[PDB]
């Protein structure tokens, strides 16, 4: 079952076993490859493993399955921030903020904190 594999992947993430968790989200994908959350969860694994190219590919797969995904736009913004595409990264982080507000999701100050990091980096490069 893809949901059981997603939950196992979640337990491995909490135990800081990121490649093991990504492999488990891959098993969930094999069982049902039409669920955006598995790609988003694996993209997060890739960011922790510093594999932004593989994280980016998963964000695009997730956005094709769920255009309203807060986490997919957020993780996409983090990839673009790592690649120094500041304008695109800010736009994705801003979209993530907008979708979280619409969906009544509360991640504390995570999204505004991230936008502040991106705007600071955009200014440094323009200076």
């Amino acid at each position: 079952s893809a949901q059981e594999l997603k939950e196992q992947g979640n337990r491995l993430f909490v135990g800081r076993k990121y490649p093991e968790a990504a492999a488990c989200y891959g098993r969930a994908i094999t069982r049902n490859p039409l669920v955006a959350v598995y790609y988003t969860n694996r993209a997060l694994c890739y960011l922790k493993m510093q594999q932004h190219e593989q994280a980016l590919a998963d964000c695009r797969r997730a956005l094709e399955l769920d255009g309203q995904s807060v986490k997919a736009h957020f993780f996409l913004g983090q990839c673009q921030l790592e690649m120094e595409s500041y304008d695109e990264a800010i736009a994705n982080l801003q979209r993530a903020y907008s979708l979280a507000k619409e969906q009544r999701l509360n991640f504390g100050d995570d999204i505004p904190s991230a936008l502040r990091i991106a705007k600071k980096k955009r200014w440094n490069s323009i200076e």
Partner: peptide
């Protein structure tokens, strides 16, 4: 509780 955005959904 894993309430941060840097957490997988689940």
């Amino acid at each position: 509780a894993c309430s941060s955005i840097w957490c997988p959904d689940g």
